[PDB]
Design a protein around this ligand. Structure first.
Ligand SMILES: [Mg+2]
Ligand SMILES: [Mg+2]
Ligand SMILES: [Mg+2]
Ligand SMILES: [Mg+2]
Ligand SMILES: [Mg+2]
Ligand SMILES: [Mg+2]
Ligand SMILES: [Mg+2]
Ligand SMILES: [Mg+2]
Ligand SMILES: [Mg+2]
Ligand SMILES: [Mg+2]
Ligand SMILES: [Mg+2]
Ligand SMILES: [Mg+2]
Ligand SMILES: [Mg+2]
Ligand SMILES: [Mg+2]
Ligand SMILES: [Mg+2]
Ligand SMILES: [Mg+2]
Ligand SMILES: [Mg+2]
Ligand SMILES: [Mg+2]
Ligand SMILES: [Mg+2]
Ligand SMILES: [Mg+2]
Ligand SMILES: [Mg+2]
Ligand SMILES: [Mg+2]
Ligand SMILES: [Mg+2]
Ligand SMILES: [Mg+2]
Ligand SMILES: [Mg+2]
Ligand SMILES: [Mg+2]
Ligand SMILES: [Mg+2]
Ligand SMILES: [Mg+2]
Ligand SMILES: [Mg+2]
Ligand SMILES: [Mg+2]
Ligand SMILES: [Mg+2]
Ligand SMILES: [Mg+2]
Ligand SMILES: [Mg+2]
Ligand SMILES: [Mg+2]
Ligand SMILES: [Mg+2]
Ligand SMILES: [Mg+2]
Ligand SMILES: [Mg+2]
Ligand SMILES: [Mg+2]
Ligand SMILES: [Mg+2]
Ligand SMILES: [Mg+2]
Ligand SMILES: [Mg+2]
Ligand SMILES: [Mg+2]
Ligand SMILES: [Mg+2]
Ligand SMILES: [Mg+2]
Ligand SMILES: [Mg+2]
Ligand SMILES: [Mg+2]
Ligand SMILES: [Mg+2]
Ligand SMILES: [Mg+2]
Ligand SMILES: [Mg+2]
Ligand SMILES: [Mg+2]
Ligand SMILES: [Mg+2]
Ligand SMILES: [Mg+2]
Ligand SMILES: [Mg+2]
Ligand SMILES: [Mg+2]
Ligand SMILES: [Mg+2]
Ligand SMILES: [Mg+2]
Ligand SMILES: [Mg+2]
Ligand SMILES: [Mg+2]
Ligand SMILES: [Mg+2]
Ligand SMILES: [Mg+2]
Ligand SMILES: [Mg+2]
Ligand SMILES: [Mg+2]
Ligand SMILES: [Mg+2]
Ligand SMILES: [Mg+2]
Ligand SMILES: [Mg+2]
Ligand SMILES: [Mg+2]
Ligand SMILES: [Mg+2]
Ligand SMILES: [Mg+2]
Ligand SMILES: [Mg+2]
Ligand SMILES: [Mg+2]
Ligand SMILES: [Mg+2]
Ligand SMILES: [Mg+2]
Ligand SMILES: [Mg+2]
Ligand SMILES: [Mg+2]
Ligand SMILES: [Mg+2]
Ligand SMILES: [Mg+2]
Ligand SMILES: [Mg+2]
Ligand SMILES: [Mg+2]
Ligand SMILES: [Mg+2]
Ligand SMILES: [Mg+2]
Ligand SMILES: [Mg+2]
Ligand SMILES: [Mg+2]
Ligand SMILES: [Mg+2]
Ligand SMILES: [Mg+2]
Ligand SMILES: [Mg+2]
Ligand SMILES: [Mg+2]
Ligand SMILES: [Mg+2]
Ligand SMILES: [Mg+2]
Ligand SMILES: [Mg+2]
Ligand SMILES: [Mg+2]
Ligand SMILES: [Mg+2]
Ligand SMILES: [Mg+2]
Ligand SMILES: [Mg+2]
Ligand SMILES: [Mg+2]
Ligand SMILES: [Mg+2]
Ligand SMILES: [Mg+2]
Ligand SMILES: [Mg+2]
Ligand SMILES: [Mg+2]
Ligand SMILES: [Mg+2]
Ligand SMILES: [Mg+2]
Ligand SMILES: [Mg+2]
Ligand SMILES: [Mg+2]
Ligand SMILES: [Mg+2]
Ligand SMILES: [Mg+2]
Ligand SMILES: [Mg+2]
Ligand SMILES: [Mg+2]
Ligand SMILES: [Mg+2]
Ligand SMILES: [Mg+2]
Ligand SMILES: [Mg+2]
Ligand SMILES: [Mg+2]
Ligand SMILES: [Mg+2]
Ligand SMILES: [Mg+2]
Ligand SMILES: [Mg+2]
Ligand SMILES: [Mg+2]
Ligand SMILES: [Mg+2]
Ligand SMILES: [Mg+2]
Ligand SMILES: [Mg+2]
Ligand SMILES: [Mg+2]
Ligand SMILES: [Mg+2]
Ligand SMILES: [Mg+2]
Ligand SMILES: [Mg+2]
Ligand SMILES: [Mg+2]
Ligand SMILES: [Mg+2]
Ligand SMILES: [Mg+2]
Ligand SMILES: [Mg+2]
Ligand SMILES: [Mg+2]
Ligand SMILES: [Mg+2]
Ligand SMILES: [Mg+2]
Ligand SMILES: [Mg+2]
Ligand SMILES: [Mg+2]
Ligand SMILES: [Mg+2]
Ligand SMILES: [Mg+2]
Ligand SMILES: [Mg+2]
Ligand SMILES: [Mg+2]
Ligand SMILES: [Mg+2]
Ligand SMILES: [Mg+2]
Ligand SMILES: [Mg+2]
Ligand SMILES: [Mg+2]
Ligand SMILES: [Mg+2]
Ligand SMILES: [Zn+2]
Lengths: 112, 50, 252, 87
RNA sequence: AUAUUGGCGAGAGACCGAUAGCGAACAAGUACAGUGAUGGAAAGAUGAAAAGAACUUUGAAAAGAGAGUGAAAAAGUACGU
RNA sequence: AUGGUGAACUAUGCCUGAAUAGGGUGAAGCCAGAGGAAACUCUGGUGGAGGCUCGUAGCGGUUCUGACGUGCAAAUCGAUCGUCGAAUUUGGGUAUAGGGGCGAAAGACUAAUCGAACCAUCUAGUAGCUGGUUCCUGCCGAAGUUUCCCUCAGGAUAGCAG
RNA sequence: CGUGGAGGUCAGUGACGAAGCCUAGACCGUAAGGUCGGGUCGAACGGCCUCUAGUGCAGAUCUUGGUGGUAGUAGCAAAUAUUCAAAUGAGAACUUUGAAGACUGAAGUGGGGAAAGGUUCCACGUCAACAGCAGUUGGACGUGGGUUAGUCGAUCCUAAGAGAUGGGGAAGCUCCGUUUCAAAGGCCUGAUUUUAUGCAGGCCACCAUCGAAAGGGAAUCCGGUUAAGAUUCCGGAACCUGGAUAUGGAUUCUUCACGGUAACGUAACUGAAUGUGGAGACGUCGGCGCGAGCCCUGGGAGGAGUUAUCUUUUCUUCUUAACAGCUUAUCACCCCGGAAUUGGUUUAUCCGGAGAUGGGGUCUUAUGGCUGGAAGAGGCCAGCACCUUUGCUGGCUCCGGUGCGCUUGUGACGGCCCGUGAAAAUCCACAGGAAGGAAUAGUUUUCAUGCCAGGUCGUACUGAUAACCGCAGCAGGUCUCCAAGGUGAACAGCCUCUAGUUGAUAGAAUAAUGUAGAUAAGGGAAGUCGGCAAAAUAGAUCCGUAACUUCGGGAUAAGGAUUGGCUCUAAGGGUCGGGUACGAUCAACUUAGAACUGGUACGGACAAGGGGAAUCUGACUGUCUAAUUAAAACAUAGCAUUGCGAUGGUCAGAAAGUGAUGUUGACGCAAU
RNA sequence: CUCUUAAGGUAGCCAAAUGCCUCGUCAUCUAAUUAGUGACGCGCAUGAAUGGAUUAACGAGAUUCCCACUGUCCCUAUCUACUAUCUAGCGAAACCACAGCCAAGGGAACGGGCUUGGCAGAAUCAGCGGGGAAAGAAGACCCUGUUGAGCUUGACUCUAGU
RNA sequence: GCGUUGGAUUGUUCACCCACUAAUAGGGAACGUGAGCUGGGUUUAGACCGUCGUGAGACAGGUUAGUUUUACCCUACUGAU
RNA sequence: AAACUUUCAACAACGGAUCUCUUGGUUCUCGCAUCGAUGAAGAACGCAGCGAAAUGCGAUACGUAAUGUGAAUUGCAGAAUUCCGUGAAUCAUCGAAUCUUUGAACGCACAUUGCGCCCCUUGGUAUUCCAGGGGGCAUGCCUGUUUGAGCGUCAUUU
């Protein structure tokens, strides 16, 4: 029965105007406005939510200590870890195959 | 209307102030000729057009 | 009478393109030193729907030869190209689906898409889903290359004009009946305001040459001259023949 | 429905107050005043509208500076002060 | 030497006399209409002087009836005829 | 004719928002079972498809040729009815302006205005047509015919009259 | 003959009464008119010769103003509805208070807002006009009072689009273009110790600006308080941004932290240029899962109602904000291990040697839990006090249950597309490693704590059968949020709680004719252009359903039966301990069957399809003539034809270094 | 066979929303059918994307028949509310040459008035639709005018463009 | 003097058939009668066909859809003081 | 016989003709030449002891200064020192000022009392942040000053 009203001049059900009903200490029902839900930071390589990392609306990240915005690995709060395994492996092999590539064509040049 | 600009409110203020009967002492001036206030507006007879 | 529908289109007030969701213009790389002496590598990062278009686009990124950064490009994706694929662009590139080579470096018979009409114009010919152009010969003196466009026309262009190997993706889109008015609705909702379409034969004379009469009917030949005049060209403009096409078309 | 049911939807202004002329003919979307022409450097007026002209020409306002030009002309654009005399 | 339905200053008429004369003799380009361009009225006169009716009486009051003022209320702020 | 003013209604596009009881139907995909020499065929579930359907709100406006018809109202009211999840409804913002727009096309709609809007001016537009044309008395006193005229409801010419 | 003005004249008339107006009194004239008397009146006016013209009205559907008969007449009849008494007042059908009867019925006649209005809000006074009776009442009249913000909006950002500038057209008002064919500008610190800011590097080339009070977006809550303000005042308790900064902690002799195999942990834990990543940031529908509030409900402690009789009864109070600590999750991921007898698994069949099932860990903190805030507040009671401000003192404010419930939020999924469903400001992160740093003492403000500041404008109220638009207090129109109980499929209809109304001239009668609502023996479309209107049908369960067909339908085809109340029976679930067959209890309406029973009634009001056979015609759904045409008209998919390879086709423009299609390219654009 | 054409209407369909004659002829439905349907076809004047024929499904579309239903009707009757009506208060409008009893005659050939007759008695209330050739707009149609406008075209005269 | 009908088709008047009946005569009254009704036909604006026309359009050809205003006065008439 | 209707008259209504007014209009004629970036014309909002308008004025606001006059102003109140006087006045004149927010309108905007930059100064422990006071920054073009660009181009270096 206790019905409720918007607390701001905007009377429309827009995403910036979500309401939640709540029982005050005065023992009555009253609307409370609600900020949009934060979405989780995503990985730049694969796109998944990156674990270890807080989820805040973007400016609220400035209000919060550095450890909420990283994990302690290379590429910490940026790429996803299995993603950094890949980067490392591929780097090593390709940097190795480079020496392999060179020595072959150093040999081609002297055997021609 | 109801969340206004200062311009409209300024105009509304001048409007409220001009809204009153003749100041009766005027009637008694030598050669006075003004009976009553002929420029009286009312919110439900004539609109301001802003 | 009044200005007819096909004349009002030109001021494009309510006739402009519905452009908001578009990914951006699809174009080849600017024809630089890389692409025109050697080859340069990119990666297709994303292949993606472009509203109003049939063929998907491919987002491809390359290193900037002159500055430390990544420069992204918007291609039309050829059937077969994929995310993670390496794309090679240049004179000294190699003949693979997805690569972009000047028509002079590709043998007769090569199949290509998004080809330039002049070198560097970043691509003009055969972009619509399914289309492509065939290289059918070269004239090494005054380096030209003769190609055959989707339309059937043959045309010769500079052997430096570039093209991308293969066919544009999304083929056969038009093999499927729209079925309902509403699918055409959503079709043209993302293109431009050309739908639906009142027959001029259902309007009044003020409105159109075909307008009026106590039965619906055109009342004069509907094949209109080339040298007719704005307000006159409705119907079969400059039509050199007319009637049901009988027997094999096919450009000879 | 073209008459009074449709008059009920009239709650949006085509014109507001014009900064230059005060009149409420400042067309919002057009951003120009249907009466005085703002923000055209010039003032709207037309020789086919003599009434309108007369409604707005010089002398229909205070003439805060022009009032005094003719006295000033009359006394040869004097400068200085008047001196003094007696009784 | 010529022009001049604008401006400032002046002198005038076999001109109009408040439905006339400028739309406006007046708090008139006002009030009022229209989203806007624009449209746009009605409305002068107590008496020499307010001396604008003290006071009594009937009435809830407005007012009435007396009285009074005035050359006249057969001039009472509805007001010259 | 010239120069201006309008998309507060409405038509259409664009940008940004919002809105839509409860039912009926039972499409792909999927699971289990049965028959059969074989090819293959069948049953029961599950699932929740559609410019699908019953029907509110909504949006529309079919019939009563109902009310009203100097109205509640310059388009309304009642019943009954069309559609009701999309070619849906709809706020605000924004674009298109008069021989111009806009039109799923009715010459529709473009602010009660549309087979060319509204405002002012040119403009006291022209009228062989229609209406009216203000005091008295005295004297005289007609014509509707001739001829020519894009002449036939008009003129000019002669006649009649002062 | 008569009128307004002019020259002349009569030394004309007149305050001892000019002009004007009235007058079935007089007189002159054939008449136009002229003269007198009387009354009224108050300042000017007339005869004659002559001059002059805006010079004579019954008409023009003449112009403006005034006025009649019509007529005390049409009417003041939609929206269920009013009544008794008191009080006030000159006056009461209509004001106020009490009582009663009703209504709206949470899809509101409730509680708020957007647009619009602009003071209508509130108080005191108060009725001439206005509120188509009234009026002591009012949105009226008179006089006053009233709108308080770092945190709500604006302001910032960008959207469609608007629009300066170098320029190019145009006689010109101006038109084009918006990064364009331009020498387009400012940041970070160093160099200064003449000094205040010149040059020394290196970048960055982004080239206006306006455009959203529903899009994006830094940050506030509860309780109290006013006649009228309140997320704005007061009380308490927070948080954000900017600026200052010092103390503590942390780090360092291995200089720029350790721990964990790992996912990753943390109170901290240097980081310029440049680069890159993320967030902002995104359709729609379906079922399933979870949260919140609401709904239902047991025990207990209070207050109220009913009590002839009956009811351990009916009604009601039992609340907990932002913010902060710990804790909390579907998903996802790590370690171990190595899978056919394939297993795991959703309501929805998807997953595994690219490593499943299993066991053990890591993470996001939506959301919830306990504690702080915080019982001191608020809620409900009892016991005293006394004209008074209004107090004072006490208690209690507790423990549970339930689910295809309802509304809303949210997750993991799934359906759809020739549809795949914004942008920008802004915030952070990472790669990089220019640099700057300690042991006789340095580094550290992304850890804690501490200091200062946060301007400008809006803020009352109405939001509609009276505050807006329709000439108006007009049965019309005008965008949105919250949403209780029963019946029932239900946000239907009908009844109700909370709130709010009880406004709509009134009285008396009940003729005709009406409008709106009903019924009719026998017949049954004979009425009528025509079954127009009306009537009939209807829910649900079961039975049973034709031609024809694009195989999807046609179909609720058609046609039948059944249905209340009460009383029983049966079927359908949860949770637990079981060495390495069952027990125990707690909590839900669904479905079917069986007795009994009544004036044969039972979808008992409400609600709720008439059906069939054919012809014409448009395939369908959709669309239009606002206000006489909704259709066979328009559209549409489908079919076919035409133009065009950009130095182009179609179209725009007065012109142009102009424009639409075009962010386009023949599976395209344009035209039939 | 003959004239003749660019070709001389093919497959289909029909008194069809296309057939003059026409209510075509035959069949069917009925007691009775200018209706409906099925047939027929020298079809005034059917016919192939000027689209022809066929078509399940859908229709507030036009049409015909049947069942159920019924106050549509035979044939009317009765009831409720609100009106009308009477009162207090309040109080418009349209219209109006002057006005308001007929018969006949004549008359601008249909009189309230005029001529000759009938006749005729204050003041009035509810009804009513015969008359007031009642009222609502200087005819919708028709003609005239040396009056237009929308629209078309090998009309006259031009024009942007090309 | 007194009666002169019930139906099927058609918007019909007319026509035509069924059937009853004593008979189913013909006419006038602004081709009686729309502030009495109806609105089917005819005859505006939507629309389909056929014929004609190069076309806009036309058709005494066929089709479908298409807003019916006011009485309270006078007289007449019905009743009523 | 009344009532009612109609005619006349008297007094009273209704209405505003007529007569007489006239600080307005209309036309003619004569004399004169002066708007604005030194911010015009126009707009908005304000200002009085007690004003809503019209008229006037600009936070110095129905006015300040100056000059002439010579005692008012007046609806009421008022001051009262202003009356043989540097002196009354809603007086005249006018030479000096003040002149909000705007407007060609000029830092940028403007349906916003919106948003920068620069200089001097004051206050907050401040070249840097905040707040107060003053003073500034549009565009085209001309002359000039300064600083510059270009193998457009001359000469001069060793
Ligand atoms: Mg609020
Ligand atoms: Mg964390
Ligand atoms: Mg972390
Ligand atoms: Mg565009
Ligand atoms: Mg369209
Ligand atoms: Mg079409
Ligand atoms: Mg077409
Ligand atoms: Mg048409
Ligand atoms: Mg034409
Ligand atoms: Mg043509
Ligand atoms: Mg035609
Ligand atoms: Mg045709
Ligand atoms: Mg209209
Ligand atoms: Mg209007
Ligand atoms: Mg607009
Ligand atoms: Mg402009
Ligand atoms: Mg300007
Ligand atoms: Mg003179
Ligand atoms: Mg006058
Ligand atoms: Mg005159
Ligand atoms: Mg006048
Ligand atoms: Mg005067
Ligand atoms: Mg007036
Ligand atoms: Mg007088
Ligand atoms: Mg007078
Ligand atoms: Mg006087
Ligand atoms: Mg008296
Ligand atoms: Mg007298
Ligand atoms: Mg007198
Ligand atoms: Mg008096
Ligand atoms: Mg609009
Ligand atoms: Mg159902
Ligand atoms: Mg549907
Ligand atoms: Mg339906
Ligand atoms: Mg239902
Ligand atoms: Mg509809
Ligand atoms: Mg009707
Ligand atoms: Mg009526
Ligand atoms: Mg319905
Ligand atoms: Mg034209
Ligand atoms: Mg023209
Ligand atoms: Mg034009
Ligand atoms: Mg037409
Ligand atoms: Mg109009
Ligand atoms: Mg004339
Ligand atoms: Mg004229
Ligand atoms: Mg003539
Ligand atoms: Mg001739
Ligand atoms: Mg003649
Ligand atoms: Mg004549
Ligand atoms: Mg005279
Ligand atoms: Mg005169
Ligand atoms: Mg005598
Ligand atoms: Mg006198
Ligand atoms: Mg004379
Ligand atoms: Mg005259
Ligand atoms: Mg006369
Ligand atoms: Mg007269
Ligand atoms: Mg007359
Ligand atoms: Mg006459
Ligand atoms: Mg009365
Ligand atoms: Mg009456
Ligand atoms: Mg009535
Ligand atoms: Mg009452
Ligand atoms: Mg109720
Ligand atoms: Mg309901
Ligand atoms: Mg109400
Ligand atoms: Mg409110
Ligand atoms: Mg208001
Ligand atoms: Mg009174
Ligand atoms: Mg009122
Ligand atoms: Mg701000
Ligand atoms: Mg421009
Ligand atoms: Mg902005
Ligand atoms: Mg905003
Ligand atoms: Mg917002
Ligand atoms: Mg207060
Ligand atoms: Mg540590
Ligand atoms: Mg968004
Ligand atoms: Mg919060
Ligand atoms: Mg472990
Ligand atoms: Mg998606
Ligand atoms: Mg982040
Ligand atoms: Mg109200
Ligand atoms: Mg008005
Ligand atoms: Mg209303
Ligand atoms: Mg209320
Ligand atoms: Mg009423
Ligand atoms: Mg009622
Ligand atoms: Mg019966
Ligand atoms: Mg029967
Ligand atoms: Mg019929
Ligand atoms: Mg018939
Ligand atoms: Mg059937
Ligand atoms: Mg259809
Ligand atoms: Mg349809
Ligand atoms: Mg219509
Ligand atoms: Mg329809
Ligand atoms: Mg077909
Ligand atoms: Mg050029
Ligand atoms: Mg035939
Ligand atoms: Mg036929
Ligand atoms: Mg027949
Ligand atoms: Mg024949
Ligand atoms: Mg044909
Ligand atoms: Mg078929
Ligand atoms: Mg149908
Ligand atoms: Mg038929
Ligand atoms: Mg009556
Ligand atoms: Mg009585
Ligand atoms: Mg009335
Ligand atoms: Mg007679
Ligand atoms: Mg006789
Ligand atoms: Mg007569
Ligand atoms: Mg009659
Ligand atoms: Mg009449
Ligand atoms: Mg006529
Ligand atoms: Mg002629
Ligand atoms: Mg026309
Ligand atoms: Mg010709
Ligand atoms: Mg030609
Ligand atoms: Mg006859
Ligand atoms: Mg007749
Ligand atoms: Mg009649
Ligand atoms: Mg009629
Ligand atoms: Mg009809
Ligand atoms: Mg119809
Ligand atoms: Mg009448
Ligand atoms: Mg009647
Ligand atoms: Mg009556
Ligand atoms: Mg008298
Ligand atoms: Mg006098
Ligand atoms: Mg004069
Ligand atoms: Mg002179
Ligand atoms: Mg001016
Ligand atoms: Mg004054
Ligand atoms: Mg002195
Ligand atoms: Mg003075
Ligand atoms: Mg000052
Ligand atoms: Zn203006």
């Amino acid at each position: 029965a206790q019905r409720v009203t918007f607390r701001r001049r905007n009377p429309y059900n827009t995403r910036s105007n979500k309401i939640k009903v709540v029982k005050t200490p005065g023992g009555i029902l009253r609307a409370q406005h609600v900020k949009k839900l934060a979405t989780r930071p995503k990985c730049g390589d694969c796109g998944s939510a990156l674990q270890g990392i807080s989820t805040l609306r973007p400016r609220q990240y400035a209000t919060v200590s550095k450890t909420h915005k990283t994990v302690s690995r290379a590429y910490g709060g940026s790429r996803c870890a299995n993603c950094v395994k890949e980067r490392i492996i591929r780097a090593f092999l390709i940097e190795e195959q480079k020496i392999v590539k060179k020595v072959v064509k150093e040999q081609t040049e002297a055997a021609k | 209307a109801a969340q206004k600009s200062f311009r409209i409110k300024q105009k509304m203020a001048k409007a409220k102030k001009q809204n009153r009967p003749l100041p009766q002492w005027i009637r008694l001036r030598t050669n006075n000729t003004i009976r009553y206030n002929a420029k009286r507006r009312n919110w439900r007879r004539t609109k301001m057009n802003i | 009478g009044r200005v007819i529908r096909n004349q009002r289109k030109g001021a494009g007030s309510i006739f402009t393109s519905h452009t908001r969701l578009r990914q951006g213009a699809a174009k080849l790389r600017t024809l630089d030193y890389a692409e025109r002496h050697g080859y340069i590598r990119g990666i297709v990062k994303q292949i993606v729907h472009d509203s109003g278009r049939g063929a998907p686009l491919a987002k491809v990124v390359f290193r900037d030869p002159y500055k430390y950064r990544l420069r992204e490009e918007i291609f039309i994706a050829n059937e077969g190209v994929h995310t993670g694929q390496f794309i090679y662009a240049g004179k000294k590139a190699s003949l693979n689906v997805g690569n972009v080579l000047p028509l002079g470096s590709v043998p007769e018979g090569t199949i290509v898409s998004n080809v330039e009409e002049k070198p560097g114009d970043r691509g003009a010919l055969a972009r619509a889903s399914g289309n492509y152009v065939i290289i059918i010969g070269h004239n090494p003196d005054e380096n030209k290359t003769r190609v055959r466009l989707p339309s059937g026309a043959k045309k010769v262009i500079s052997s430096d004009a570039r093209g991308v190997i293969g066919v544009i993706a999304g083929g056969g889109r038009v093999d499927k009946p729209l079925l309902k008015a509403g699918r055409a609705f959503h079709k043209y909702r993302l293109k431009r305001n050309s739908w639906p379409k009142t027959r001029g034969v259902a309007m009044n004379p003020v409105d159109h040459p075909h307008g009026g009469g106590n039965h619906q009917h055109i009342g004069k030949a509907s094949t209109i001259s080339r040298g007719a005049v704005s307000g006159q060209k409705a119907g079969l403009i400059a039509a050199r023949r007319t009637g049901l096409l009988r027997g094999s078309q096919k450009t000879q | 429905g073209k008459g009074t049911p449709s008059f009920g939807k009239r709650h949006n202004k085509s014109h507001t107050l014009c900064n230059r002329c005060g009149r409420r003919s400042f067309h919002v979307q057009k951003k120009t005043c249907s009466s005085c022409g703002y923000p055209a450097a010039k003032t709207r007026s037309y020789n086919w509208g003599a009434k309108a002209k007369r409604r707005h020409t010089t002398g229909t306002g205070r003439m805060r500076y022009l009032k005094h030009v003719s006295r000033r002309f009359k006394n040869g654009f004097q400068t200085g002060s008047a001196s003094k005399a007696s009784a």
